[PDB]
């Protein structure tokens, strides 16, 4: 009622008091000493052209080497980055595919979309064939991410406005995560995989808490839909990429936002967003048929990543760091280095 | 063989062939550059367009040394095989050329009038091996001036050339009647049902676009009769009535210019395919 | 579960036509390299055959290249091979191995049973060293195995295979590759070495481990085992 | 019903009690880090292509 | 310079591309379209002759088609909309006796508004049914129409009624020459439907196949 708004509003205003208080100088002053990276030359070394619809979710095996692609055509396809081969081909029950995943030990793949259902595909049988381990359902909404905490546990995002951690062997959510209202597009585990961000719609991103479940800290200051997320490398800060052409650092412990990634060329939003080895560059896939390898430090434009005749849906790093991997709305993959 | 006359030719040949050479291999070229640069997943459709402007861009580069026999008036500087060879390469470009066409053309009929045909369906590997058949076979129809002897050495001429005006010739002119009097049927056929299909239809016609292509389609047909009519026809006058036209001084002249006006059809076929698509 | 079962085999008058068949079933056939390898009663393995995914690669030894055929039955899930002018060499128990190639995958992991046939009356030298050796449980035994050209190609990867053939059963894999393990292999066994110097060790041994073993290469065909050590008590 | 508001109440109250550190740090630790680990890291400074494995 | 085992890595990824050609060319003569509605519009009933999305599959003269219905995706349409650019044709159903109150003719305008003028939508091509036209007539036949069109100048005959509906519906689009938006007066219990979508879907791949050839 009246007295539950008033307080509402008072603790918020509390909040800004806090943040505005703990923030001294924006890390631009601090950083001005430092040696600019300069210009980032990346070449195509390799490109994969197997599939034949627009690709919209790809992510990098462990061994750094091997990576799976999702696509509209129905088809999951496990590349060998090294020589280009087609280690698997698997056909997808729903043609709808928004997100893919990889398992740490490689044993399995995830996959999901508008069929509001995660399955789990086991790669490595006996009798020589890729078989689906498990179909999770209970979520109301589309699937827009989904991560393999191990072997054994899968943490999703889906587009009810809910997170929910699963339980291969059961197939029931172990905790559900109901912070958000608006549609959950985006997720990123931790480090130590002890929890995770997702981006909404609504122009927030909250830090969860996968032993328990509940809220941390949200984080604002986006002006329209978050459409990717993913953690700095330190695990104690993440980048948010949204609708408005802008891409935003904070920082888990002091709770606010650190730098902007903005320019007034680009008008367009941001569909993916990874970071490097060592965090000092920030990789953002706008609309623009072009990825921007943003100087995270410095929030200046290192490099241009122009190869893609269409929209660029998805954007991996390898964990070695060795190759960066695109995969635009043309149906073809592109690895830099 | 007999010695005709010669002189306007060579001052009004050179002009118009060079004329040629320039406008076509400037866009037969820039025309397959795009086809090889810019244009992906390649459709039935633009294999033939493709091959069609191989050939064309092959009689573009084989004018060049007749333009010789033209600079002088009637001397070539080679002798036997660079004559067999480029007569040869000629008629087998300006065959190509006109089977391409008709390739269009009848890929163009199916794809308006039986969108959910078969045919529709061929994929990119069986175009080309259709295209390499119908190449194949205009090779082998064309061996045959290859496999020949037709220097014509009379007074200090040095000539050399097939369209002689010495009781005209055997099958290659049969040949030259038939390789424009079917693609010509085949072309007026396919046009003519493509423009009566696409009118049938009134919520599509109402679009200005599908009037461009039907206007388009009209404009094609117009273009290859009205380029390849006078060579015909002057090549049929020649036929009839050769004891009183052998050797005839204007026949001559006449003849070589109107197969000069048949050769920009080559130039100008890039410019009506290629530089009106959207693409 | 997975079965490979082979029939043909029996009594051949020399000079015969002789036709054996391999049938699988409790796995994907059609995407799996069939290889047929025989062993002569008292010698070892002996590579034979082999037809790939599709059929389109097919080698042969160079004892049998002319006289033998291979050929596959995917919708049947049969694997024949078809002998003509058999001659006393020829005979053996053969076997019907199958392998399955891509990154990572593990080729040779399941042998069939084996059918028995009986006729009246450049390659890369394997060389295996010692032919016996006793042990007894609780120790640990080294079996060294050696190749003529250096097995280490330029991918990173030496192409050489490990083998245990249990008395009166099918042999079966323990390492592929000289480093990795096989799937349902105990964690005692391991292997290690490098180019033309492979060993594999058996930590802390126990019984059901007696047999002769084979090493075998795969840089490049035709496939060549060893002679075989064996381990008694 | 209002147990809506009483929710984000409570979220609001329990989010408001949490550690806050100074931003200036922050930034400086997280400098610190990207320096660090500058050293190894093959996109920012190329390889040489000998072991290069994308190098074709 | 591949070894055995490289070389038949080779050889099965070449088999995999070969049977993912084949799937593809398989899969790019079948016709995709979008079925699109209010929820109580009349979707059920138009798909009934032939947790998520829920996938339509029927064969009419020998053509393949595959009808999607999002149905109960209860959530941002801006968000996945764009997974639909590319359809062959969308179905946009809407009722024409559902115009009493509780009024839903304005929000039908209002979807019809978001759809048609959309910027992944410019070229497909959208086919409005409008069905309940018996009970629409019945509805007609007692209260006027004036209680949905307050700028309405007519009699209450279903003919110039329905005309006029059919006329402010299609007047929403923007772009009136580079998409086509056909009409049809459904709810007649026969082969009618899938014939003029089968029609539509003639005219959609005869303007798709003059362009591979430049013809455009
Ligand atoms: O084969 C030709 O293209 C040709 C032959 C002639 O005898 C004269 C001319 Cl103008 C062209």
Redo the contacts between chains.
Sequence with gaps: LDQLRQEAEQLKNQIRDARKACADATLSQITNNIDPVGRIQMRTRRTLRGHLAKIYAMHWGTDSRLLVSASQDGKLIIWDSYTTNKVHAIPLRSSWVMTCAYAPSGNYVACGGLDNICSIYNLKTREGNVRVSRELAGHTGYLSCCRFLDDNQIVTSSGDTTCALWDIETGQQTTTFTGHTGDVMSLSLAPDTRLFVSGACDASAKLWDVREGMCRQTFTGHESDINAICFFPNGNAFATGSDDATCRLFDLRADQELMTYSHDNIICGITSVSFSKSGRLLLAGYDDFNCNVWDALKADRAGVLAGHDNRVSCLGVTDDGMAVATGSWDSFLKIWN | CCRIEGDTISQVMPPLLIVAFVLGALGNGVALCGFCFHMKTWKPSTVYLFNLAVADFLLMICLPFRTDYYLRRRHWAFGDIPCRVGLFTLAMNRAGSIVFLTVVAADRYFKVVHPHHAVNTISTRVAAGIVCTLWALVILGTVYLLLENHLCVQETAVSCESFIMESANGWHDIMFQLEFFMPLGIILFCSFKIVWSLRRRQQLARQARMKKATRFIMVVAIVFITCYLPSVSARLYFLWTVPSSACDPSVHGALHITLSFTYMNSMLDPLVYYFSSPS | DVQLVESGGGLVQPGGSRKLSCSASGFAFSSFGMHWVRQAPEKGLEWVAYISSGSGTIYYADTVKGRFTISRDDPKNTLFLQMTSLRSEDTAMYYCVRSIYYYGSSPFDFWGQGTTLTVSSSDIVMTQATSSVPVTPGESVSISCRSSKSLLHSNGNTYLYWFLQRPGQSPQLLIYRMSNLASGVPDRFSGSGSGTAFTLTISRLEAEDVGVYYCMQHLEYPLTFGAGTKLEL | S?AQ??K??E??????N?D?????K??????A???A????????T??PASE????? | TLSAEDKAAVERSKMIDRNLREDGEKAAREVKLLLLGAGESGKSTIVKQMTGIVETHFTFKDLHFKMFDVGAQRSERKKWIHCFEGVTAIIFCVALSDYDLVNRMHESMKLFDSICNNKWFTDTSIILFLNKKDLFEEKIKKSPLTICYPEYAGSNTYEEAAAYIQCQFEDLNKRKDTKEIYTHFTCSTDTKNVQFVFDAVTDVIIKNNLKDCGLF
Excluded: G
Aim: hydrophobic share 50%; proline share 7%.
């Design positions: 209002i508001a009483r984000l109440v979220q609001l109250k329990m989010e408001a949490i806050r550190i100074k931003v200036s922050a930034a400086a630790d997280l400098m880090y990207c320096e680990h500058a050293k190894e890291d093959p996109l920012l190329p390889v290069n494995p994308f190098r074709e």
